[PDB]
From a paper:
We have described herein the reactions and the structure of Pgp3, a Csd protein of C. jejuni. This enzyme turns over the cell-wall peptidoglycan by both the d,d-endopeptidase and d,d-carboxypeptidase activities, as documented by mass spectrometric characterization of the requisite reactions with synthetic cell-wall fragments. The Pgp3 monomer is structurally divided into four regions: the N-terminal domain (NTD, residues 21–95), a flexible linker (residues 96–147), the LytM domain (residues 148–259), and the C-terminal helix (residues 260–273). The Pgp3 LytM domain contains a highly conserved tetrahedral Zn2+-ion-binding motif (H168xxxD172 and HxH249).
By using the H247A mutant variant, we successfully solved two structures of Pgp3 in complex with a pentapeptide (1, Ac-l-Ala1-γ-d-Glu2-mDAP3-d-Ala4−d-Ala5) and with a crosslinked muramyl tetra-tri peptide (2, NAM-l-Ala1-γ-d-Glu2-mDAP3-d-Ala4−mDAP3-γ-d-Glu2-l-Ala1-NAM). In the presence of the pentapeptide, excellent electron-density map was obtained for the mDAP3-d-Ala4-d-Ala5 segment. The importance of these two complexes is that the scissile bond in the peptide substrate was seen bound within the active site. The critical portions of both peptides with Pgp3 are shared motifs between the two structures. Both peptides contain the common motif, mDAP3-d-Ala4, and only the third amino acid is different, i.e., mDAP3 vs Ala5. In the pentapeptide-bound complex, Arg158 might form salt-bridge interactions with d-Ala5. Substrate carbonyl oxygen displaces Wat-2, thereby interacting directly with Zn2+ and polarizing the d-Ala4 carbonyl bond. This renders the amide bond susceptible to nucleophilic attack by Wat-1.
Numbering used by the authors: 20 to 273
Write the structure that this text describes.
């Protein structure tokens, strides 16, 4: 019941007489424990940027309240001190609008909660190469965090086939300002995977997709630093450390 910022954890709770799980009147959804039928699960995530120092949750049962305290740990993320901090960019109106529009779309998707499992066992990595840029690489103008790498980058020459980390429904399959050519998949229970900077999109919004199924070709779209696959996980409303999430998720749903 310590959690590093930008990570998810799976809380286990007794199923019997459970009524709700709350965080200051935010209801946290619950789903079945796959291997213990007397338990349920909930995903709790702390944001990378500007998280609470401590979190208290209440699980309300028919005959009892149960408090749950989680301290925010800082972790050991690569960070470096920005030296400029003009901090305010001044983009053209046409770009501000497209960003704004795409941000409203994405927030509508990531806020929605499909209350069933759309995945199929464990997550696989979307590509069998290696990490060239880690999740959580931060740029700080003290005393906090100016920007951070909200996913992890795999080495990929332009045109490398990218496969869905798990089964789900495609919710985004288009070119967006920061993500380039983007695929976003709903796996259920508020878990979304993100495949950014693609050179080709091979799926369509609404499509049901299987684990291991081709979703496009890596590229360098929307990416300044050249070709790579940006892979993200959003869970519990927040961007979380994707390889961390996958190992925790797979430890439960294998
Ligand atoms: Zn990235």
């Amino acid at each position: 019941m310590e959690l590093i910022k930008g990570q998810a954890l799976f809380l286990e709770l007794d199923k019997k007489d459970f009524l709700s799980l709350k965080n200051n009147d935010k209801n946290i959804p619950t789903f079945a424990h796959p291997k213990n039928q007397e338990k349920i699960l909930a995903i709790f995530s702390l944001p990378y940027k500007n998280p609470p120092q401590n979190t208290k949750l209440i699980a309300f049962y028919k005959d009892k309240k149960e408090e749950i305290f989680i301290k925010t740990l800082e972790g050991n993320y690569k960070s470096e001190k920005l030296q400029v901090e003009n901090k305010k960019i001044f983009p053209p109106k046409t770009i501000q609008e497209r960003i704004a529009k795409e941000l409203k779309e994405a927030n509508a998707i990531y806020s929605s909660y499909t209350p069933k499992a759309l995945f199929n066992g464990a997550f696989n990595i979307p590509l069998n190469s290696f990490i060239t840029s880690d999740f959580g690489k931060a740029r700080t103008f003290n005393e906090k965090v100016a920007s951070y790498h909200s996913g992890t980058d795999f080495r990929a020459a332009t045109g490398t086939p990218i496969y869905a980390a798990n089964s789900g429904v495609v919710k985004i399959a288009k070119d967006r300002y920061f993500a380039g050519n983007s695929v976003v998949i709903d796996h259920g229970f508020g878990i979304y995977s993100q495949y950014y900077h693609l050179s080709k999109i091979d799926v369509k919004v609404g499509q049901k997709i299987k684990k291991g199924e081709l979703i496009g070709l890596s590229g360098a779209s929307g990416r300044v630093s050249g070709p790579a696959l940006h892979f993200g996980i959003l869970a519990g409303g927040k961007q979380v450390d994707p390889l961390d999430f996958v190992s925790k998720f797979n430890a439960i749903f294998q």
